[PDB]
């Protein structure tokens, strides 16, 4: 659950929405849809 990161999902929901951009930990590298079950 590390995301002390930049959002860098290469979805449109962080791209844009700044609600799940903030601390994600999405391991950058997130780039497919149904693997962005992220909401933070
Ligand atoms: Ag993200
Ligand atoms: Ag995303
Ligand atoms: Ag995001
Ligand atoms: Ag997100
Ligand atoms: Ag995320
Ligand atoms: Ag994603
Ligand atoms: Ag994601």
């Not at 860098?8 to 149904?34: I, L, Y």
Request: glycine letters at 10%.
């Amino acid at each position: 659950q590390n995301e002390g990161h930049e959002c860098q999902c290469q979805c449109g929901s962080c791209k844009n929405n700044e609600q799940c951009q903030k601390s994600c930990s999405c391991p950058t590298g997130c780039n497919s849809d149904d693997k962005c079950p992220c909401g933070n």
